[PDB]
């Protein structure tokens, strides 16, 4: 792929935006984004409160310097601060005092499951130094109770996966690492950061630097390789490019792409997802009377039956008032994910509906296999479905494509950023 | 060349000695001399009589974890000794009204005063090991940190390790950076630490049993003299004769006991620096902080604190053992205060222990490493905390390194992190 080629980036989430941003240094880049902003799952909604206007992260919220070095470095270079936002967690179930949390040892569930929490930490710490099973399999295989599976493991895993997810089917190392890196924990609040004035700040900066190259509100309808180059059909027009980089979800990538080949069907067809509803609201009734200063608060509703555990599901609520920059703020600012009961519509600021990728061992395998179509027909692929999960994974896949199309990894000097890049470059087959 | 079935003495029955003896006894005729009336040294568990039974309360060595202490952890596992999590929740109180911070919530005037610096500090410690042979103190000065942060946050939280008498701010930076990046110490969460079931003594009791009458308690070695034939040890008004001698005593003890014509021995063992610690096991509930609720570790600085005189002044750390899981049904207060400044109500004191700890300044580390040039000369060997990395894993693995060197290989080769720790500590000592 020679210099100054005409290149399209389809999808303006984190992966696409970063990929575009880097590519624009060497190539004539156009970036198509379906919705009216840049960031995708990274969205920050303004809330005006008696102490000012605050941008509240509704999808992507959390990362840290160790897990997310490239994103972290990027935030730093753009002069965006961060702050610690510890993952304190409270779980409530139907009965009297049927709770645990990871700040104190109070609650009946904690009492019921403490020995298992204790064992679990040890075993997760011992794993990465020795197992292509799911967390669920592991738990069954190693003597853990069903109460532990569905009253502790599955709710704490909802911090990542949404309360609709079959999180217990997700890959074991994902969970083991989360516990050994103090991201999820039954004994302490996990070490996580947020970005100053919302996650969108970095994306706003990218949007500015890209200028007129960014086509918002322009959903690509299809993408067709030809003998000369690749044609993109978007917004009642046809545009002509030398290369096309996909930064869309596989099921979108597959619908849009229209080729004679059926390996494309073989690879992109079987990706599975999970719906998530993020409801930004001020209805203080969703806070737990027990769950005091806990950032993350899970409630399972009346009617929970352990026998029917796989069908039933709770809601996770985040108390943003516990964040340090919100500590002077007088209005409640809450986000409930996947609420089962409806939220008082007089108190709802806004909803967003999104989907997240399943992370079963098979899905990981499926992601990796996308290397055999990478570069064929002047097509490239980045996004969460090509990488490790989380935002670092998303955006670094963008960087991997840009490196592959000439524009090298911009932080070679940063040892952990570089290693993450090398690792993700190895994960994708690029 | 140390051939099989040689007569070998281990001088000192702390963790290092006991483990070293235990392994050596598989190949050699071992005797282990310990000065005091039990095996373990700083590892001491005192019985306390309570409404739930008899509890063994750790007074010195208390905490470790599977990641930091793989060999110790495996040993407990093989002996069938359980562990439990004992999160390091921390509350700091200073003289004023509400002059506190803690690592469970964001309450307190000191939290308000210092939040920005705690936040920055975590980042910077996480970024360090991926890039610096200075002290934590130097680092803090060099990187713009306030004196309030140095003496009201860093020095108190470092007292969890060093004792409230220590010049902790002069200790090595990587020691601190690692502690923060491994979630051992933290300003935002409770650190991940474990305790052993029925006290730390459990493993040592098991070692004592397996060694049998090879263990001489209450038998302080008076001196150790190499000769042409072997080495003579003078203890308990008698002389015993050995082919080799392994020291598991502190350098200043090792030096007093040892007597040779050589003055490199003086050069190496002479300049080791220590810190006193008083551990007071008691039931005076007045030492608990009215603010500091369910916090395991509670630091108090007394009235009279002057930031300008910060280097002379010092607080006391109190541990609320009633917050530990196995003590949750217990109705009597069980507290340990370390280095109390005010006196503890002697009607409520169960027992005191006075101990000393090694200083961990960059120079002290250098000093430890240099002990390789005397290792094996005159049929003498050296293990213990003064030869190794700090903490119990370091102590006991130094014992294992000597045993490996005297034939008995590292007993946990198939545990990858245990083996790597062994290799690392073998490299640290020059053995
Ligand atoms: C509720 C929620 C919370 C999350 N929280 C976190 C968190 O705290 N931390 C974290 O690390 N990760 C989080 N994630 C993961 C998140 O998916 C990644 O961090 C990252 O944002 C994924 O980026 P992406 O660019 O790969 O996909 P997306 O962010 O979905 O963006 C892809 C873009 O493609 C666009 N698109 C779709 N069809 C078309 C078309 N025809 N034409 C043009 N564009 C199209 C979409 O409109 C979208 O903007 C969260 C996800 C969700 C749903
Ligand atoms: C208060 C305190 C708390 C601590 N807490 C922890 C903790 O929580 N976690 C952790 O990992 N580490 C901790 N340590 C560190 C501790 O030093 C090591 O874990 C380890 O126990 C030191 O082992 P050692 O055998 O090298 O020294 P010691 O355990 O001190 O052993 C030295 C032994 O030599 C003996 N001795 C002295 N003179 C003679 C003589 N003439 N003849 C024979 N024997 C003699 C002593 O009686 C003693 O038994 C703590 C130390 C102290 C003081
Ligand atoms: C090697 C490395 O550094 O990356 C690891 C990935 C660990 C993830 C980055 C941890 C989770 C993400 O950071 C972010 C999840 C985020 C916090 C979602 C938040 N969601 C919500 O708030 C709502 C409730 O849904 C490796 C794992 O990545 C794969 O995706 C995973 C399936 C694995 O098996 C790998 C071991
Ligand atoms: C290789 C490895 O993992 O070990 C690291 C050191 C990590 C320490 C051993 C971590 C803490 C100790 O294990 C535990 C100290 C213990 C909790 C003392 C408790 N004391 C008390 O309770 C009272 C108040 O005195 C490396 C450091 O070891 C060196 O000793 C240190 C001086 C260093 O510079 C190295 C970086
Ligand atoms: Ca009860």
Numbering used by the authors:
A (entry chain A): 4 to 133, 139 to 438
B (entry chain B): 3 to 133, 139 to 438
Extract from the study:
The enzyme LkcE from the lankacidin polyketide biosynthetic pathway of the bacterium Streptomyces rochei represents an interesting test case for understanding such gain-of-function, as it exhibits a monoamine oxidase (MAO) protein fold yet also carries out a macrocyclization reaction. The catalytic mechanism proposed for LkcE involves initial oxidation of the amide function of LC-KA05 to an iminium ion. This is followed by attack of a C-2 enolate anion on the iminium to give the 17-membered lankacidinol A (2)8—an enzymatic intramolecular Mannich reaction.
In order to obtain complexes with LC-KA05, mutants E64A, E64Q, Y182F, R326L, and R326Q were soaked with the 1/7 substrate mixture followed by rapid acquisition of the X-ray diffraction data (owing both to the low availability of LC-KA05 and its high instability, it was not possible to carry out co-crystallization experiments). Of the five mutants, only E64Q and R326Q yielded co-complexes with 1; 7 was not observed in the active sites, as the acetate of 1 was clearly visible. The structure of the LkcE E64Q/LC-KA05 complex was solved at 3.03 Å resolution and that of the LkcE R326Q/LC-KA05 complex at 2.50 Å resolution by molecular replacement, using the structure of the LkcE/EMAA/DATD complex as the search model, and the presence of LC-KA05 confirmed using a weighted Fo−Fc omit map. In the E64Q structure in which R326 is present, the protein is identical, but the substrate adopts an alternative orientation, which allows it to interact with R326 (3.1 Å between the C-23 carbonyl of LC-KA05 and the R326 side chain). In both structures obtained in the presence of 1, the observed linear configuration of the polyketide chain would not permit subsequent cyclization involving the C-2 and C-18 centers (they are separated by 13.2 Å). This observation is consistent with the idea that LC-KA05 bound into the E64Q and R326Q mutants represents an on-pathway, pre-cyclization conformation. The side chain of E64 would then initiate ring closure by acting as a general base catalyst to activate the enol (there is no counterpart of this residue, to our knowledge, in other MAO family members). This key role is supported by the complete loss of activity seen with the E64A and E64Q mutants.
